[PDB]
Design a protein around this ligand. Structure first.
Ligand SMILES: [Mg+2]
Ligand SMILES: [Mg+2]
Ligand SMILES: [Mg+2]
Ligand SMILES: [Mg+2]
Ligand SMILES: [Mg+2]
Ligand SMILES: [Mg+2]
Ligand SMILES: [Mg+2]
Ligand SMILES: [Mg+2]
Ligand SMILES: [Mg+2]
Ligand SMILES: [Mg+2]
Ligand SMILES: [Mg+2]
Ligand SMILES: [Mg+2]
Ligand SMILES: [Mg+2]
Ligand SMILES: [Mg+2]
Ligand SMILES: [Mg+2]
Lengths: 170, 194, 188, 134
RNA sequence: AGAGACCGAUAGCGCACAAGUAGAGUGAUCGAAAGAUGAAAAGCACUUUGAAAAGAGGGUUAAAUAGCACGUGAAAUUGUU
């Protein structure tokens, strides 16, 4: 509530599927690790595993560290997410949080209203040419995450057994 | 006669409004958070006893908030109290003040009897209490944020001086022009708001 | 206007102050006696106004908002009083205005030893006391309505019209300020 | 209950007429009652409100506020009262629109025209009372 | 001009709106979609991050998950948990 910062963006013209995969890849991570990984994705040094939206995509060796075979490098999604993470960093700094221990606690990509264009087909036909923009929303929280009734309605026979056993034992 | 001093000195009394009542004599007044509470507590016995008390009576309060204005959340905790203040007559005629003193002593019993209200009345009071608590933590946060904002402003000025000092002549010129252009752009963006 | 009337009176009074002999202790003492008589008369009418107020013993409830100190950025304050108490308080502020005037007069006449304002000072405090708001409502008996509405505005001059903001009897605001929880301030 | 064929009790027609009335009709629509003192003085119950009138607000969140009518915005069916104002975000002061039927006229702006009006109303009311009292 | 056991924004005239308009056709002709913030714009000052769009604080309001993609806000379909 007071140990968290949040950021969001709406109607961002970036691929919703790629952004969802990237957000799922960085979900639950430390902020610095997520930023480094996103820059690595932009530089094609680390890959985002394509899990749900992966139909007929390619295979790469960089998916080994995720256990998958299909992974890609959604550069545009990585840039948008880097911008949003930086905004969350600025919000945390303004609030006075320790930005060196922040954790990506919440991240969510939703579909935004679609933008319309046209494409021209054979035999004088017109088909839709749509973009799939997304809303992104994320919450960073400071990480602590250090986590460290009685029988009441017994029968008379049960209670007698308990008492006998206790008397016999001691 | 004592409404001014009661409101000014008593923090808890300042959380309530002040309304007259047709039942009471024109020299008395009721201070409450709810007309339902006023109806439940303004008994004819109390009205008659206060009439008997007369001008010796100063005030009678049922409260859970402190006399002085709290400054911390640990301070602002409920603490049930019943207070009775009155002036001392010069002739020592205490029989007139006996009804007030007796009813005051029996106040906890009557309050246990009748001072239970439907959730709508409770929600009316706890909203005010939550607003007060929020006001306290608000000022706490403004003080902390002001201190850290002063620190950040000093850091910004230091960074500007440190990086602007070692640039080239044309680099400094371009940097100043960019600062001015960005400031003007943001000012025009603020001005273009409908 | 009272300003113009006072200035017109002064135009003749400070003429007479340069023509009546002031080297004469007898004439000076006659003027002093007139000034002290005026002071005692305004004592009398202030006491009579207080007596009329006490006789009336009006217990009507009144609420208003006092402004912050002039020109300050502080919060306002809420006053819930009775009309009896407000009348008493304004009689007392008239008394304090007296005491201030008397002190200033004694300072400029006995320590600095100035003599010109004596004629004007023997009239203007008396005229203001006779023309005051309660010298209207109680001494003269006109009703306390309109400009005679209870929470009188600040008695300032032009700087009063600038910074001496009018007391607010707003029902919307009074209710807002009434339950703000601003009592119990640590005098300190 | 209406009887005359020229009068219509159509809600649609009434609303259309009210919300598309011209300025002269809106003047009569935006009438305000007189105070008790003025009513006793002039034998007139209500009059169309005018800029420069002094009014007291008797309904709404601004009850008991008094002031001079500074503008009669017929287009918005409201009036503007001196010092009955509000603050925008910028802190700029804007007047608050008050319906004239929510105020009472405590002091009238009087010139022969505003008065021929009062004399006509008074004469009509007195005649009607006399005829009914016959 | 007055009415109705009529319809209530896919209904009722094609048209509750800059509708016989926008647009199509060489032309004769064809011909839509599209109403609702709030009592009042009081339509978010100011700080901060950002190249910007915007975000985060903060403010207005009875209410902002009522913020000009504005009453309510279903299902299909989607994201997170
Ligand atoms: Mg497949
Ligand atoms: Mg295949
Ligand atoms: Mg293929
Ligand atoms: Mg073709
Ligand atoms: Mg598609
Ligand atoms: Mg239709
Ligand atoms: Mg529709
Ligand atoms: Mg149609
Ligand atoms: Mg054409
Ligand atoms: Mg709608
Ligand atoms: Mg809010
Ligand atoms: Mg809602
Ligand atoms: Mg709503
Ligand atoms: Mg909605
Ligand atoms: Mg569904």
């Amino acid at each position: 509530p007071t140990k968290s910062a949040r950021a969001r963006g709406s109607y961002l013209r970036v691929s919703f599927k790629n952004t969802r995969e990237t957000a799922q890849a960085i979900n639950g991570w430390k902020l610095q690790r997520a930023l480094t990984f996103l820059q690595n994705v932009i530089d094609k040094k680390e890959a985002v595993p394509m899990r749900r939206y992966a139909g007929s995509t390619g295979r790469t060796a960089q998916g080994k560290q995720w256990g998958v075979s299909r992974a890609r490098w959604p550069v545009k999604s990585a840039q948008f997410l880097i911008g949003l993470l930086k905004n969350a960093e600025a919000n945390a700094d303004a609030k006075g949080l320790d930005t060196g221990n922040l954790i990506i606690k919440h991240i969510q990509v939703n579909q935004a209203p679609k933008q319309r264009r046209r494409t021209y087909r054979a035999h004088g036909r017109i088909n839709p040419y749509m973009s799939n923009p997304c809303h992104i929303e994320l919450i960073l929280t400071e990480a602590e995450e250090t986590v460290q009734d009685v029988e009441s309605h017994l029968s008379s026979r049960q209670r007698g057994v308990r008492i006998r056993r206790a008397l016999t034992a001691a | 006669e004592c409404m001014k001093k009661a409101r000014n000195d008593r923090y808890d009394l300042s959380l309530t409004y002040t309304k007259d009542h047709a039942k009471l004599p024109n020299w008395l007044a009721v201070m409450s958070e709810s007309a339902e509470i006023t109806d439940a507590l303004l008994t004819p016995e109390l009205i008659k006893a206060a009439e008997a008390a007369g001008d010796l009576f100063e005030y009678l309060v049922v409260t859970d908030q402190p006399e002085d204005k709290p400054k911390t959340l640990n301070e602002t905790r409920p603490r049930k109290r019943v207070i009775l203040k009155y002036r001392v007559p010069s002739n020592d005629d205490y029989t007139s003040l006996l009804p007030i003193f007796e009813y005051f002593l029996r106040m906890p019993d009557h309050l246990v009897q009748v001072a239970h209200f439907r959730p709508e009345v409770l929600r009316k009071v706890k909203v005010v209490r939550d607003e007060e608590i929020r006001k306290i933590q608000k000022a706490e946060e403004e003080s902390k944020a002001e201190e850290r904002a002063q620190e950040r402003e000093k850091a910004k000025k230091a960074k500007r001086d440190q990086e602007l000092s070692q640039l080239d002549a044309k680099a400094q010129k371009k940097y100043l022009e960019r600062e001015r252009e960005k400031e003007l752009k943001r000012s025009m963006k603020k001005a273009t708001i409908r | 206007s009272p300003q113009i009337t006072n200035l017109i009176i002064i135009f003749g009074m400070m003429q007479v102050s340069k023509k009546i002999p002031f080297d004469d202790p007898n004439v000076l003492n006659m003027c002093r006696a007139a000034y002290l008589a005026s002071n005692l008369i305004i004592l009398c009418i202030s006491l009579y106004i207080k007596s009329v107020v006490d006789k009336k013993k009006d217990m009507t409830t009144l609420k208003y908002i006092e402004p912050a100190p002039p020109g300050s950025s502080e919060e306002g304050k809420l006053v819930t009083t009775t009309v009896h108490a407000y009348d008493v308080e304004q009689v007392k502020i008239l008394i304090k205005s007296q005491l201030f005037g008397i002190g200033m007069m004694a300072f400029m006449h006995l320590y600095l030893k100035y003599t010109n304002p004596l004629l004007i000072q023997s009239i203007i405090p008396l005229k203001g006391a006779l023309e005051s708001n309660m010298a209207k409502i109680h001494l003269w008996g006109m009703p306390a309505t309109g400009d005679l509405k209870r929470p009188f505005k600040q008695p300032g001059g032009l700087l009063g019209g600038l910074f001496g903001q009018s007391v607010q009897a707003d029902k919307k605001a009074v209710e807002a300020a009434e339950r703000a929880g601003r009592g119990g301030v640590k005098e300190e | 209950m209406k009887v005359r064929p020229t009068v219509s009790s159509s809600r649609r027609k009434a609303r259309k007429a009210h919300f598309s009335a011209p300025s002269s009709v809106r003047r009569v629509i935006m009438s305000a009652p007189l105070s008790k003192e003025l009513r006793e003085k002039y034998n007139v119950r209500s009059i169309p409100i005018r800029k420069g009138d002094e009014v007291q607000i008797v309904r709404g969140a601004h009850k008991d506020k008094e002031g001079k009518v500074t503008s009669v915005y017929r287009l918005k069916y409201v009036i503007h009262v001196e010092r009955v104002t509000r603050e925008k975000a910028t802190g700029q002061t804007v007047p608050i629109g008050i319906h004239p039927s929510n105020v009472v006229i405590t002091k009238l702006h009087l010139d022969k025209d505003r008065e021929n009006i009062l004399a006509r109303i008074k004469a009509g009311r007195e005649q009607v009372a006399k005829a009914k009292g016959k």
